[PDB]
Amino acid sequence: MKAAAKRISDGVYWTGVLDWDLRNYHGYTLQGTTYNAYLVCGDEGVALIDNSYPGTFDELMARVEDALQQVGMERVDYIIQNHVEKDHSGVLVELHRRFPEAPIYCTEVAVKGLLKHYPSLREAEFMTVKTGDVLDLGGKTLTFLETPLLHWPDSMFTLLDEDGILFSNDAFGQHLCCPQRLDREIPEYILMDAARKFYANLITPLSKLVLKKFDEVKELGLLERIQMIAPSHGQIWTDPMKIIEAYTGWATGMVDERVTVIYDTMHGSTRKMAHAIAEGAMSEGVDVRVYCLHEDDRSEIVKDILESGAIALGAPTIYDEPYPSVGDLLMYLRGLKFNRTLTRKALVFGSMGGNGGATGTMKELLAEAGFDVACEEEVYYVPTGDELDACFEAGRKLAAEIR
Amino acid sequence: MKAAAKRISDGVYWTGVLDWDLRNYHGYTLQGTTYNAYLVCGDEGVALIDNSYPGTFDELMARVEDALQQVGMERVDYIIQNHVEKDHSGVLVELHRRFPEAPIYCTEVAVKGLLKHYPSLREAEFMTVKTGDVLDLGGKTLTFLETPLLHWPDSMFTLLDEDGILFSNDAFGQHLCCPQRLDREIPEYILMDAARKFYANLITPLSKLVLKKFDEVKELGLLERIQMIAPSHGQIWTDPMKIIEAYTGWATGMVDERVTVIYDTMHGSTRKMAHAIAEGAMSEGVDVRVYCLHEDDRSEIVKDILESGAIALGAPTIYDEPYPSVGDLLMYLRGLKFNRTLTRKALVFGSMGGNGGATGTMKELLAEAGFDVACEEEVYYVPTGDELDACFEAGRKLAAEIR
Ligand SMILES: Cc1cc2nc3c(=O)[nH]c(=O)nc-3n(C[C@H](O)[C@H](O)[C@H](O)COP(=O)(O)O)c2cc1C
Ligand SMILES: Cc1cc2nc3c(=O)[nH]c(=O)nc-3n(C[C@H](O)[C@H](O)[C@H](O)COP(=O)(O)O)c2cc1C
Ligand SMILES: [Fe+3]
Ligand SMILES: [Fe+3]
Ligand SMILES: [Fe+3]
Numbered sequence: 140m141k142a143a144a145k146r147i148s149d150g151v152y153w154t155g156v157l158d159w160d161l162r163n164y165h166g167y168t169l170q171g172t173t174y175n176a177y178l179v180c181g182d183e184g185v186a187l188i189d190n191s192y193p194g195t196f197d198e199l200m201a202r203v204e205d206a207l208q209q210v211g212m213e214r215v216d217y218i219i220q221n222h223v224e225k226d227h228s229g230v231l232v233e234l235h236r237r238f239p240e241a242p243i244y245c246t247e248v249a250v251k252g253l254l255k256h257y258p259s260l261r262e263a264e265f266m267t268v269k270t271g272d273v274l275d276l277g278g279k280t281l282t283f284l285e286t287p288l289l290h291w292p293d294s295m296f297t298l299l300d301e302d303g304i305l306f307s308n309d310a311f312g313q314h315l316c317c318p319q320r321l322d323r324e325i326p327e328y329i330l331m332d333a334a335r336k337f338y339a340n341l342i343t344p345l346s347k348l349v350l351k352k353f354d355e356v357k358e359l360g361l362l363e364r365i366q367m368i369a370p371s372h373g374q375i376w377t378d379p380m381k382i383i384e385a386y387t388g389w390a391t392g393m394v395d396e397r398v399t400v401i402y403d404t405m406h407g408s409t410r411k412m413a414h415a416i417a418e419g420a421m422s423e424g425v426d427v428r429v430y431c432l433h434e435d436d437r438s439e440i441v442k443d444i445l446e447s448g449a450i451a452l453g454a455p456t457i458y459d460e461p462y463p464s465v466g467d468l469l470m471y472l473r474g475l476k477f478n479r480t481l482t483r484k485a486l487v488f489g490s491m492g493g494n495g496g497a498t499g500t501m502k503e504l505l506a507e508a509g510f511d512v513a514c515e516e517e518v519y520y521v522p523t524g525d526e527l528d529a530c531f532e533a534g535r536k537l538a539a540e541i542r
Numbered sequence: 543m544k545a546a547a548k549r550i551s552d553g554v555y556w557t558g559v560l561d562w563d564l565r566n567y568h569g570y571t572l573q574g575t576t577y578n579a580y581l582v583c584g585d586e587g588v589a590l591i592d593n594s595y596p597g598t599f600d601e602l603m604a605r606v607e608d609a610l611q612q613v614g615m616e617r618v619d620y621i622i623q624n625h626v627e628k629d630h631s632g633v634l635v636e637l638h639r640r641f642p643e644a645p646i647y648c649t650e651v652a653v654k655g656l657l658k659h660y661p662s663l664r665e666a667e668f669m670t671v672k673t674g675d676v677l678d679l680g681g682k683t684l685t686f687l688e689t690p691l692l693h694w695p696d697s698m699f700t701l702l703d704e705d706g707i708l709f710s711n712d713a714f715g716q717h718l719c720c721p722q723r724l725d726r727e728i729p730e731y732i733l734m735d736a737a738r739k740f741y742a743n744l745i746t747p748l749s750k751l752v753l754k755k756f757d758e759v760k761e762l763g764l765l766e767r768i769q770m771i772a773p774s775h776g777q778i779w780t781d782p783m784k785i786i787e788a789y790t791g792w793a794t795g796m797v798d799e800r801v802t803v804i805y806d807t808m809h810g811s812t813r814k815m816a817h818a819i820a821e822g823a824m825s826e827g828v829d830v831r832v833y834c835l836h837e838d839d840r841s842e843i844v845k846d847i848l849e850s851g852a853i854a855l856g857a858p859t860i861y862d863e864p865y866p867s868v869g870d871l872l873m874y875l876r877g878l879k880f881n882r883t884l885t886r887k888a889l890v891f892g893s894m895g896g897n898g899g900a901t902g903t904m905k906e907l908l909a910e911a912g913f914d915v916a917c918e919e920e921v922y923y924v925p926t927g928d929e930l931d932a933c934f935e936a937g938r939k940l941a942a943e944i945r
């Protein structure tokens with residue numbers, strides 16, 4: 140198959156897979172993604188860093204073969220697996236079949252995870268690596284940095300010394316599938332918004348670990364050596380500090396003044412409330428986003444939560460409970476643990492017809508999920524003008540609090 | 543607008559609205575529904591029992607006018623509101639405008655509810671009615687029976703007792719939009735499955751109150767000669783015992799041997815488990831339904847839950863939580879309180895890549911939701927043959943236990 144490697148540096152090639160078609164990946168919406176694998180060709184040896192999702196071997200291999208042709212090398216000598224998830228290890232068995240002499244470099248935990256996914260690999264040779272271990276390729280060296288929980292127990296980064304390229308696995312990734320490989324080659328908005336969505340959905344709960352790893356990267360003296368970050372999805376950063384800074388901002392709760400209003404409704408009263416809350420918040424000059432759960436994906440909602448100092452979450456009561464769609468978001472939030480960056484303020488609200496109970500339930504679940512629920516607005520059925528005014532005031536107050 | 547009424551009884555006419563296009567109604571999927579309103583004419587007065595959704599006055603009125611002309615009458619004299627929800631009260635303001643002399647008969651609670659939805663009814667004449675209260679139309683008499691929590695605090699039934707006709711509001715309803723108005727005019731499977739879905743989604747938590755309300759009709763001696771149940775949605779029961787018996791079964795946990803297996807997955811492992819569980823259960827000869835939360839509506843899942851003595855709920859772990867779709871289904875199950883018909887047995891399962899957590903949480907949440915969670919199959923990444931055999935056995939045991 141005809142698929143070209145893309146040169147990133149002398150002897151460093153993107154040889155990944157363009158998944159134009161993927162639209163939902165573990166309840167993350169996207170418009171395609173990529174599975175970036177890299178071929179690092181030293182004078183002596185060739186390493187493949189990561190691979191790709193099952194069934195994409197033909198593409199990865201076509202690009203690998205192109206890159207080997209370009210550097211005039213014969214084979215991949217070392218298979219590096221920064222992470223075991225199947226979008227990055229899904230053709231490992233096929234790569235092991237193609238390059239039977241290539242040891243697989245990965246963390247110890249990764250070996251276990253790989254073997255569980257691919258029991259036939261028991262026969263393969265694994266080189267377990269820990270932080271600071273080095274693979275010498277001849278004029279190119281790869282230094283491994285274990286990155287447990289960033290985003291998986293098996294994860295590591297691989298730093299190409301000399302080129303200063305940090306192969307960061309999913310970290311700094313973005314789910315974008317562009318024919319352009321570099322950050323600077325696409326609109327900055329799209330790049331950063333995808334980076335943002337990726338952090339919000341995948342990195343938020345790891346935020347404290349990400350800061351700790353950055354400290355470590357700096358302590359080990361690696362930070363100053365990073366000229367490029369080449370993640371496992373999306374664009375390669377020729378401006379690594381842009382994404383480091385953004386990750387530090389995101390990990391530390393740096394936000395512009397913004398309220399995200401999220402609601403669902405059966406009969407529309409909670410929607411009227413949500414608009415009034417949004418109007419109120421807008422009145423204080425903060426940015427405002429409004430999401431309806433019936434329509435909007437949790438992955439986009441949490442993207443804006445990342446950049447919001449407060450949220451408002453609304454739902455009617457159905458048989459003493461919140462409308463169940465908030466259950467999905469709230470479970471997702473419980474996992475993301477936004478409090479790990481910033482304990483965001485929350486307003487809970489909703490219409491009800493009887494004893495209510497949605498806002499209380501939501502308040503409890505938001506607490507569990509690391510939000511500071513200061514206020515609640517609850518309306519019996521259809522909000523009166525006064526009640527809608529009170530919702531505006533609630534949103535104004537919420538916005539004023541995060542100013 | 544041309545729209546004909548339907549004579550369903552002597553001086554009792556159907557004058558409702560066909561909502562062909564509705565697909566999703568407060569998180570209940572349907573293929574349209576009806577807002578059944580009935581023109582009960584006697585010797586003196588004409589009650590409109592319930593009405594229809596906002597923006598459908600032209601259709602309703604057209605049928606009421608066509609009914610009045612079929613009975614040779616001038617006006618609706620009484621606007622009966624068994625229930626305040628907007629699908630049955632959404633043209634009440636317009637009815638009050640068209641029939642300003644008609645008082646509105648409803649429960650005391652319904653007045654507060656109606657007034658909140660439609661403030662302009664502050665001027666309206668309300669006649670509040672309680673259990674045992676009557677409305678003589680001449681020679682035809684309506685009886686009210688409060689049915690708080692069936693399904694709302696405002697709800698009641700209107701009885702044309704002596705004719706054995708029950709206007710049951712939502713009770714016994716089904717979300718069906720057919721040209722045919724009667725139970726016996728459409729396929730029994732469709733009728734009963736829509737009635738089943740309706741019970742599962744709306745009635746389940748009210749099961750005990752349903753049984754108690756049957757008892758109260760019986761004690762009030764009103765039950766005696768049931769000939770028609772005319773609900774707010776869907777088909778009119780010319781065979782009311784069919785649905786009464788079905789409700790009694792549903793309320794009392796009468797099930798055939800059936801396991802419903804429900805799962806979500808990111809990379810397919812939990813799906814493999816779900817299949818093996820389903821296979822195990824099938825080996826015991828019981829009926830098995832398998833739903834995927836990414837694909838399937840909670841309203842359909844719970845329709846099967848109602849007809850199942852056991853369920854299996856599976857999901858992978860994401861940042862220490864169940865995959866979030868299960869948060870929606872659980873929050874829904876929590877409102878439905880299936881344990882009020884039968885404490886069904888449940889198996890939780892799922893794949894995980896580190897510490898797991900989802901099955902434990904799902905165990906906790908399902909038990910809060912009214913299930914007897916008989917254990918837990920958690921697999922690290924991809925199941926081995928033995929692990930799948932273990933899932934088979936878990937489903938077999940689940941099934942065997944419900945035989
Ligand atoms: C199936 C159903 C069940 C409901 N159960 C409750 C309940 O248990 N408690 C309550 O206060 N309201 C209950 N409600 C009433 C709604 O909460 C009320 O209609 C509210 O105004 C709806 O808000 P919304 O317009 O944003 O959907 C229920 C409504 C429906 C659709
Ligand atoms: C975003 C992400 C976060 C994850 N977090 C956890 C975790 O917190 N604990 C755990 O045990 N596994 C975690 N996993 C690992 C998955 O549970 C594991 O891949 C599992 O085998 C997925 O099962 P599935 O194939 O049914 O989707 C995570 C996976 C992803 C994609
Ligand atoms: Fe990953
Ligand atoms: Fe990835
Ligand atoms: Fe209703």
Ligand SMILES: [Fe+3]
Nearest residue numbers: 629712774775
């Ligand atoms: Fe209804």
